[model samples]
Target chain A: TGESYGESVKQAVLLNVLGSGEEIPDPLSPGERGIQAKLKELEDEQRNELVRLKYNDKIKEKFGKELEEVYNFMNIKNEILPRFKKAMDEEKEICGIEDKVIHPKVMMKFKIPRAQQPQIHVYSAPWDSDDVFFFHCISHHHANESFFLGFDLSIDLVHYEDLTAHWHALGAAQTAAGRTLTEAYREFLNLAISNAFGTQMHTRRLVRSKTVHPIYLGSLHYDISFSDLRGNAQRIVYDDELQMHILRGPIHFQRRAILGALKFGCKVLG
Target chain B: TGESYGESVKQAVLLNVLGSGEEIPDPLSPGERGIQAKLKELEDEQRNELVRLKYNDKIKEKFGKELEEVYNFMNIKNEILPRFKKAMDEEKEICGIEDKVIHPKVMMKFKIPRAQQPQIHVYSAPWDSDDVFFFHCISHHHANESFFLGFDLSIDLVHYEDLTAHWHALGAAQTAAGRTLTEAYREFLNLAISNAFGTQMHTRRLVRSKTVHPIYLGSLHYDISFSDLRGNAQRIVYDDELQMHILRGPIHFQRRAILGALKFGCKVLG
Candidate 1:
């Protein structure tokens, strides 16, 4: 049919946000109402409240210098988060997304894995890739349709200098790799390898073990038996045509379930 | 850390629709002015009228056939696009993205690459991949802000049986490829090869050439000389630390501009 409609006539911005949480905007508000609302909202989710109260009964000091880290985090969030939000809004405008700017509240909790428990004791950035989640509204245009974004009320921003450093290292890597085929690329390749290792290092930096066990068993013998309980993956063909995979995204069900089982073991074993 | 409180949460649905080349709804009809509005709207951009008129002055067969295809596609869009949409929505829900259901009407127009090319030829599937563009509402929850979803005025659908075929294919893909791997995944053999070929087949089954050209001569002779004009990617290493490429994601400015020039070549020369 010898016609062309350009390469990619469509694009989408799934979402972008400031705080990856949601709540009812104080439909009517006094300035104080905003904080009140956040407190009440955090109260709904236990994990959130823990963050709000900034109190963890646990022995780990890494949780924040136990609390000091969080207050500073909150104070400075306005300084940085809004930048991202504004940037995203600007980008949304640029993309012609014309969709509403939704500030849906999100709630998140993670169950750490047993194998990674050893690394949990040292403080590191808190977040896994899928921590930010977006929820869709079941009904149409309903005011209460909730969506969520991954946000850490306690995120520590990368310092401006580190940000700048990450920038230059990347530029040098791509450039040196681009110009020369062999030597420069080899050097560049090693650089990327090291950078990847660095990110992975930062990713794994932690205050405590990511491992856990079930609470019901109260860290009992069940996990030992469970540890030996190997779960295997079996292919369940979902479709014969188009060959697309379901849930091949931010979440993987079977893996998580098994992982969840292991984490349950960690919580109880301790 | 145990706290619980329930507060109001909100969600919204933004417009999402297809080829958006709709004729105005019979405005004064007891049924209403929907179609009429599209006319007024499409009329805003002259191309919409040419499409509504359907009878191209220069030709008969191409235009009507094109028109016919679009009409048919619209009549039965549920057959194809929605399946994918539904599948994606279900995936979202499964991921707990329960939010509102939105049906945003999207509009699309394609320049016929060649000048006075008036050769829109009525229509072809009402659009190619790029036809659908979404608009983000300029105002915040400003009640009546509008948006669009990409749609196909026409689409070919699979039968119920194939629906399941697609189902299994996806499940199998996810299972086999998961839990974890890396590009160091490179050190190992490949599983992506077969999947890659399968995807290549599906990609070829739809759409037009991905080649591009720019607007300088507006997709013309410039593409010819430009075709020979080779541009390579450079790593300017905008920063040293992060190694993040500047101008990497959104408009790669000069690169895509050159690339766009190549694609402009696509519409006409084809």
Candidate 2:
């Protein structure tokens, strides 16, 4: 502590990197299977046929190039639709539900490169802060664990510049290798998220929606009164306790059930 | 999705627990080695003689009991001194620095039972959120990793009420079994936080301080002007990048350095 100013400043900078001891190895080390290798493993193994098949769907042009702005908006809007479609398809299959049971309207933003600012804050209150931190630490070590929700597939490579660079690499070496590892990684994530959602559906941790039939009639007349039907909407939600994104809303019915009801009413009126 | 309201509500409640798949086992499960057992392992193994020895130090009464108000205040003030003493001792030995090098004034609050309210939030911004969540998931798997700072030893049992109850247990069964598990747990934590700090000191990821000497004279005089001689103070800090509590401040001199200056000045004046 009684060191000279030069010595003190030297020590200050020294401890910043050396303080972690030998417990946490350099994530960028080339000697062993560092973070890059682990990430590659995830990419190579989990990138399966389901994601590829979904990505291969022909993108219909919503507008011609004459209206370039509209065309671009339409393209961008349609671009993200397939991922949600594939994710929901997998989720439904995992949940073991019929195709007509639920129609999901999901929104997503994918492949964002970086953050504008990086900062962290810790509340001083002691209550459950320690456990929140503890669970957070625990979750970090299990990066390869199976995904259970849309949130689980979310990856953050900002801490590693090399990985981020690789994610954005466009050279022939990376492109020819497999259209950049990021593409494969994204596909793996889509499948993982679907599987997680499916698992939740199967297990019953998530529900679709809720409905109330406020009014009904035994028979219909030529000019009859009708009750307005309302359905609960689903929103993408983030749960802090579990630290994951979940689809939250009331349960809904099969498209056929609503159609059948309308058909019966029209027949009676006729 | 097409289920009735009663069924929908039932499914909603049902999926919450079942959706995680076979991956995350119930921490409360008594079957096999549950969270309780893991916690017990930490208590039984890490609760060594060093912590017990420190806890046994004779606490001198600075004020008479007749002055109950003062006595209680004095007692409370003195109560937490030994923990810091032991922690610093462990940290110094870890850094392999001499006693005269650093003077640390550390504050700690141990064994908090629970939080008044529990909640979570997720921001919609996509930048590095995915990686933040990704690394978080990775850390969760390695709960047994060695501690590297004060934050590592902070235990949170709030998620598991049973663990919290055990932490606060008072019966002879718990007390006699080497104090309530919480006591042992706290002792283990004391050692852990110190070890973590010590490791950081050794690694150099943490810095002590910097100093500037504006003026100095060759010899002391009868009436010499002082340069205020202010020293940098250490504050307990929480760093989010590393997600740990660290001692932060400028480097300080050995207690002897200050004492030497005082003695020299007094002799010169006389």
Candidate 3:
């Protein structure tokens, strides 16, 4: 009567027991027998605990904390642990590179204010859904500009910008240097470096048209480590460009390199 | 302490002499009558020079290295006593390049390590710090993988293959065809030149990639004086890639003849 989880857990244990490979673990054989039985038992226990909690207030007195523990455990196991475990597992593919790999469509999430929020146009194919999360949006004000959306930036920062793959979608274009500058390239660079949006307007001068168009809107990278300071701001950055503002402060060392994408606004936001 | 120390002298000789405009003279040029005032006026001259040297050490001691360098330049500028020119002299322009290309308006003009900066190196944009100096006819025979901290120098032994097989680097080159796609235009140009030359020889070759190559790369302009030449025996043959050289001897009689034969244009205003 509740959530069915653990295939992802199965993936975790699979990766843990047997590291990673270029290909998925020969299709992750249905895990260990004991693991399956224990998982089933735990799921049933959580279900019963949930069923009793139909009257949580009444059950609170009689059930000790077990009732809440089961509830809390289920939420965390289903909601948080799987992804966290995947992250800790280290073999997971965070960055997507090729069309041949059949990317899971992805979407980035932003808490854009209702006042400043602009129109966003999103298109998805029947095949785009579920697991892999990302998408593209074009706004009303900057119709010519492209936006790569992702709900989870931690994954977006690492999983996109893969120069190794191509776009498999219909009407996908290959950039001049031979690889697809498709959304993958955009996700890698643009999503990570959006801090410059309002301040830097890139311009490319077109000869015949005799005008300048924004382009080569590029990105860079850096590897950093830091420490004790105060007066922190909840500086949520949309792109990697703004990362420098924080890391540049008084860190002992800066990542030797870094780069870009579109960052909508500058911040020291509340 | 107030703003900085440079203002004292600036308000003086600058405002009294040339505040920037056409027609120079010093109706205020202190002649005999103003001689004593001029000495104090000239006192500001040596004062600023003293400030510059104050930050730099060893000069006050008339130290070994400082005196040698000080006198070396003095002897050279003292044309009546004409000091021999060191290869490192500023008059000596960088290892040189060309093309009808949209390149960096600002060429950092990197020179060969242990050689004059290579200004003529070309790229579609100005991004990389070292890709321009990656190729050259080395003074010695060198082979094996060369690493520029990160870019790979894996030019295969294939004389022809090496030209097109390495990582494409910064500063884009607009070739007769397109961007120096695979092997650099340096290799491609030299390849064409060798084919044209009856007795051309290459001791070694390489293909190097930018350690962390920029996704959006372009070009830069370089300045190699026609002290030597960029041509074969009879025909004018030069490449902006491996960066081949230029000609300027005896007013570089041969360089002009070669460019004239090739109908190439020149711009000289060092």
Candidate 4:
């Protein structure tokens, strides 16, 4: 029968194997077993009703304390103190020049209100291979509308680090000068926005901005607004067919407007 | 504030628009009101609960009936009466000729049995591009272990006409003579399946059939076992690596087998 062939094949394969059913000795001794048993017992005790309830409460408290620290950090509004000192030092240095004695006073002002928590939104369309970048502020100006500034920065070479660094530097510069932190922040923000706009225009990219209300920053009233730099600019001004290529261009060219202001030590206002 | 250019641009765009508005009609006529009302009524009717529900139900019922009919048509079994008659006539003619001169006494016997429903299952593997085909039939010797026949039929070339033609030829041939229909059907199926296998092998196409059970007809059970023809035949026979491929290959093959049968003839029996 055909079954006999299968049986013979199986037998031939298994014949050379040694110690078919021999039991191996346990490597762990009594002391080692005792330690393992003790560990299991401790774990079981920790999982009991009273201990579990206590442990869960401790975990909640730890997370709650961390969240409180974050809340406090969000409310910090002392970004302008450093900027004031730097401006004062600059003024003193200028006074040390004796000849002619023509002294000029530098003042900074802002047109738009400060963003409590500024963030950026990035998106790309199906037609777009490169992502578009935009800046958003937490402030509402009107019903269903908020103050927002945006520019289309293509995804080509802009790293997340570059954006973060720019924000930190702008924040620090505003804090050092004696101007309102919100005003100083807006000055830098507008430059980035306008630069984004100009780059999009030159590259023929799309960009736009809009406001969103219905949010709170700690106890302070705050709203959010977004910009679709890739969409808006590409829609109204640039050639839609060539827009994708512009999106694929360099990020440094996209950052030129913001970096240019920083280099000239000019305070952005509008 | 640099307001002159902004004011001049506004005047150029706004004044032209204001001039055009003056020339156009201030209010539309009462005659246009009737057309607007009729359009609104049509829109309202479309949104009405009773109308919407009735329309949706009608569409669903219409599609359901159409689909049911299609499925029933696919499962319908057509008897190959013409082929059966032709084979019977040929056998009778041959027996008469043998009786006159060739042989002393000719015993002419015609045994025709109706073909039972075919049982099929599909199988596939991750590596294989297409499904493999299989069908099960009652074996001549053992009713418990049914004979599983692998059809090495390429899914691309499997048309409803081809299956019907083959079935008719085989069924008629077996019924005209006193042989088992299963054996005759296997011969016909093998002719097609083997041809497909040859083509696939030459093209390096991953299409083949793995037979599960030996087919028995009269005193002979055909050897339809599949050894992986992928690489060297030695690797297929020796290595355990072919196990997963063998298992998955048959399952997918079974699915297509059922689909092909159902497309041409009767529902496959379990």
Best DockQ goes to which candidate? 1
> TM per model?
0.15, 0.14, 0.16, 0.15
Residue B5, candidate 2: C-alpha displacement in angstroms = 42
Question: Candidate 2: where are CA atoms >4 Å away?
Answer: A1-177, A185-270, B1-28, B31-46, B49-270
Q: How large is the i-RMS for each model, in angstroms?
A: 32.7, 38.1, 40.6, 40.5
Per-prediction CA RMSD (Å): 32.0, 36.9, 35.3, 39.2
State the lDDT of candidate 3 residue by residue for A69-111, as single tens digits.
3333432456356544544443223222122322221122133
Runs off by more than 4 Å, candidate 4: A1-270, B1-131, B139-150, B153-190, B193-270
Q: Which candidate comes out best when scored by TM-score?
A: 3
- For residue B136, what is the lDDT in candidate 4? 34
The positional error of residue B179 in candidate 4, measured at the CA in angstroms, is 7.1
Local lDDT at A104 for model 1? 33
| Candidate number 4, chain A TM-score | 0.18
For model 3, how does the per-residue alpha-carbon lDDT over B1-270 read when each residue is reduced to its tens digit?
783445444334323332222222111111111222333433543454344334222222222233344356555333311221221121122211122222433343332222342222111101211111222211111322111101111111112122112344456853333223323434443433334322211111112212122221111112332222122211222333111122222222222222222222221110
Q: How do the residues B1-270 of candidate 1 rate in per-residue lDDT, one tens digit apiece?
A: 232221111000001110132421211111112223433443443443233223222223332333354356666533434333333343334333223322221111132122222110011111122211111111112222211111111121100000001122464463222211112121111222223333342233222212221110011121122112211111111222112211123221222222332223222111
Write one digit per residue (lDDT tens) for candidate 4, span B92-143: 3432422354231222211211222222222221112133233333322222
Best by lDDT: 4
In CAPRI terms, where does candidate 3 land?
Answer: incorrect
| Residue A13 displacement in candidate 3 (angstroms) | 46
lDDT of 1 at B201: 25
Candidate 1: segments with Cα more than 4 A from true spot: A1-244, A247-270, B1-270
For every prediction, compared with the true complex, DockQ reads 0.01, 0.01, 0.01, 0.01
Candidate 4's TM-score on the B chain: 0.19
As a whole number from 0 to 100, the lDDT of residue B269 in candidate 4 is 16
